[PDB]
Every structure is written in structure tokens, then in C-alpha cells.
Design a protein around this ligand. Structure first.
Ligand SMILES: *[C@@H]1O[C@H](CO)[C@@H](O[C@@H]2O[C@H](CO)[C@@H](O[C@@H]3O[C@H](CO)[C@@H](O)[C@H](O)[C@@H]3O)[C@H](O)[C@H]2NC(C)=O)[C@H](O)[C@H]1NC(C)=O
Ligand SMILES: *[C@@H]1O[C@H](CO)[C@@H](O[C@@H]2O[C@H](CO)[C@@H](O[C@@H]3O[C@H](CO)[C@@H](O)[C@H](O)[C@@H]3O)[C@H](O)[C@H]2NC(C)=O)[C@H](O)[C@H]1NC(C)=O
Ligand SMILES: *[C@@H]1O[C@H](CO)[C@@H](O[C@@H]2O[C@H](CO)[C@@H](O)[C@H](O)[C@H]2NC(C)=O)[C@H](O)[C@H]1NC(C)=O
Lengths: 165, 55, 110
């Protein structure tokens, strides 16, 4: 669906991530000198000693279809889980008037991939015109920094190793 | 063919039993004609694989 | 609870589960911390767990219902187990099979 959109046009939106440290990056995701993260994601952590129910909203008013790309964090170990997000187990719930999803982290080891054996499950919600988003979570959200535009196009991905001319 | 005109009901709603759709209890159709004028009006729901439960 | 299908045709059951917006609402309605609903025939199974979260306000409510169906074949017996959050059925629908279908249209009959 991205391939066919034919665009990676991103309009950043200010959300209100209250009571959380934003911008967590990592050594896996090195951005030039020190740590970093996906440029279109925002890693929410605990603030000093706390992580509260987050409950932002984001109405869409423009005359077009918004695509939102947001994640969730699967820790390696029950202590990593609490060290960040403070609770026993997170929860993320992303909704429009019509749709609804609820992931739940799964605390556990994976194989070593660039120093890490935690992971990120990515997902997508699309809000039509005049709908609304409502992100909401007690822990573990890999939160969206805004949205991508969605065109209906004649476009596609294709996998080749041919040179271009 | 025997046509049932759904009017302001989706077939799924009809089934679920939304107030303004109880006109339809026990009905039988060859072709069920879902109108674009149609709505829902009761506890807000989602049906995963709505797709299929209609079909 | 449990409910044989002793006829000789297929029974369809539409049931569901309540996801509240807050734990205040949960404990109020269904007294447990976390619920669970498991509906099962002999041959198959689905356990759905609720998700206490805030959705768009819609006709007052920011809570939600999710809808599931089980089909129970003749002989096969249905069994509903839950410790909260359940939206139970009152019975079944006759399942016929035939050339009946659904079209989406906005044009008048005659
Ligand atoms: C559960 O078991 C798995 C595998 O048995 C553990 O993963 C292993 O953990 C160690 C410690 O981090 C990793 O060692 C490292 O190897 C790298 C890569 O070559 C080396 O360069 C480093 O200096 C380091 O010593 C090892 O790679 C990793 N192996 C695999 C296959 O993932 C995992 O840590 C265990 N979980 C728990 C909670 O004990
Ligand atoms: C979590 O946050 C969301 C939004 O950030 C909250 O949703 C909002 O809740 C209020 C109900 O208190 C709604 O107010 C209503 O607005 C309509 C608009 O015309 C009006 O008809 C009603 O009289 C009422 O004032 C509001 O619509 C709603 N917004 C959305 C997008 O759902 C939710 O309540 C928050 N929950 C918690 C626990 O903080
Ligand atoms: C992507 O495209 C937008 C729109 O064409 C670019 O310009 C602005 O983007 C920022 C969001 O970061 C906002 O100031 C506006 O919504 C855009 N302006 C207008 C008039 O539409 C921008 O180059 C690109 N964004 C990024 C982050 O690279």
C-alpha cells in the first residue's frame, strides 16, 4: 500500500506526550555519532519515576486519507520492561470511530540482532477525512511523530538488480 | 428473484438486532440490497472479519 | 454454560465481548480485574481477551463491543466459559445454503 501510494510525504504533528521521556534512541540505531531511532518514530519512556495512562487524540480535518505508522516494544526481560515503562506489562490501543486494535507487549528473549534481543512490532492505522485517531497506553508505545500522505496512484515497488539507464 | 430492501439498515446490523432494524427479524431474501443511506444506531461495535460475517 | 446442537442442521451463534474505557467501569460492571471469554465447540476454539482503553466518543460511549460467531454442527456441542466481559447470545440462526447474496446499491425497486 505504500508502494502504490507512490509517496513518502510526511507531515509532522505535535502530539501531547505528557509525563514521559520522549526521543529514546539506541546503540543499534546509530545516527551519526551517538544513539538514535527511526526518524518517524518517537520512543516514549518513563518520566523520572512514573509512566501514566497516555491518552492523546488527533482529529483529521483535511480532505484526504492519513496513514499513521506506530509501534510497540517487546522487551527481553521483566526488568527491562519495568526499567523503562514501569508497569508489569504495557498495552497500546489505536482507534478510529470505526476500527480498533490492541497489541500487548510480550516480555522475552529473541536472537541477538545488532546487540539487542528485544524488538519492535510495527503496525498501521489509517484515519479517513473527518475521523479521529486516539492513541492510548499504559506502557510500551513506540509512538507516531505525525502522518504520511496517501495518494491513489498507478505506482508500484519491483525488486531487481538491473542497472538504470 | 426475491428482493429485500434494507433501507437504513446494514444486513449485519439487522442480524445483530439494532433497534431500528427489528423490522427485519426472521426475514428471508434471495438478494439483500444494502442502501448507502443506511446507518447504525446502538452500542458501538466492531466485528473482526466483518467482511466474512456479511458474506 | 453449554447447549447441544441435536437437530440435523448447522446452528450459527453471534456473540461478543465488551472492552471498557477504564478500570473504574470494569470493576463496576464485571467485578474482576481482567475478564476473558472462551467459546468452544469440540472441534474448534477461540479465546478473546478485552482491552481496557479509551476510544472515540460515539453516541455517548468511548467503550466498545467486539463481535464473534461460532458455528456448531450437528452432534458437536457449544460451550461458553467466562469470568467477566461477556456478551452472550440468546440462541442461534438457521443456516441455510443457497443462491442468496447481498448487493450494494442505491437504485429503486420496481
Ligand atoms: C537466552 O539464550 C540466548 C542464546 O542461548 C542468549 O543469547 C546470547 O546471549 C549472549 C549474551 O548477550 C550473546 O553473547 C554475545 O555474542 C556476541 C555475538 O558474536 C559477542 O560478540 C558478544 O560479546 C556477546 O558475548 C549471544 O550472542 C547470544 N546468542 C544468541 C544466539 O542470541 C540470551 O541472552 C539468553 N537470555 C537470557 C535471559 O539469558
Ligand atoms: C481520553 O482522551 C479523549 C480525547 O483526548 C477523550 O475523548 C473525549 O471525551 C469527551 C467526554 O468527556 C468528549 O466530549 C464530548 O464532545 C462532544 C463533541 O461535540 C459533545 O457532543 C459532548 O457534549 C461532550 O462534551 C469528546 O468528544 C471526546 N473526544 C474524543 C475524540 O473522543 C476521553 O474521554 C479521554 N479519557 C480519559 C480517561 O481521559
Ligand atoms: C515533507 O513535505 C512537507 C509538505 O510538502 C514539507 O513542508 C512542510 O512540512 C512540515 C512538516 O514537517 C510543515 O511545516 C508543513 O505541513 C509543510 N508545509 C506546507 C505549506 O505544506 C517538508 O519538506 C517535508 N517534511 C519533512 C519533515 O521532511
Amino acid at each position: 500500500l505504500v508502494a502504490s501510494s507512490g509517496t513518502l510525504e510526511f507531515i509532522t504533528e505535535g502530539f501531547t506526550w505528557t509525563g514521559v521521556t520522549q526521543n529514546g534512541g539506541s546503540n543499534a540505531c546509530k545516527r551519526g555519532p551517538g544513539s538514535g531511532f527511526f526518524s518517524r518514530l518517537n520512543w516514549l519512556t518513563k518520566s523520572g519515576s512514573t509512566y501514566p495512562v497516555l491518552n492523546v487524540t488527533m482529529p483529521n480535518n483535511d480532505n484526504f486519507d492519513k496513514l499513521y505508522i506506530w509501534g510497540i516494544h517487546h522487551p527481553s526481560t521483566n526488568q527491562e520492561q519495568t526499567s523503562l515503562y514501569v508497569q508489569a506489562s504495557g498495552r497500546v490501543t489505536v482507534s478510529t470511530r470505526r476500527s480498533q486494535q490492541t497489541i500487548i507487549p510480550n516480555i522475552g528473549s529473541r536472537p541477538w540482532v545488532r546487540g539487542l534481543s528485544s524488538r519492535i512490532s510495527i503496525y498501521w492505522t489509517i484515519v479517513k477525512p473527518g475521523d479521529v485517531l486516539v492513541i492510548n497506553s499504559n506502557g510500551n508505545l513506540i509512538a507516531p511523530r505525525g502522518y504520511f500522505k496517501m495518494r491513489t496512484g498507478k505506482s508500484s515497488i519491483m525488486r531487481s538488480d538491473a542497472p538504470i539507464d | 428473484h426475491r428482493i429485500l430492501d434494507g433501507i437504513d439498515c446494514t444486513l449485519i446490523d439487522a442480524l445483530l438486532g439494532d433497534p431500528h432494524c427489528d423490522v427485519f427479524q426472521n426475514e428471508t431474501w434471495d438478494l439483500f440490497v444494502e442502501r448507502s443511506k443506511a446507518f447504525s444506531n446502538c452500542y458501538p461495535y466492531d466485528v473482526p472479519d466483518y467482511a466474512s460475517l456479511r458474506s
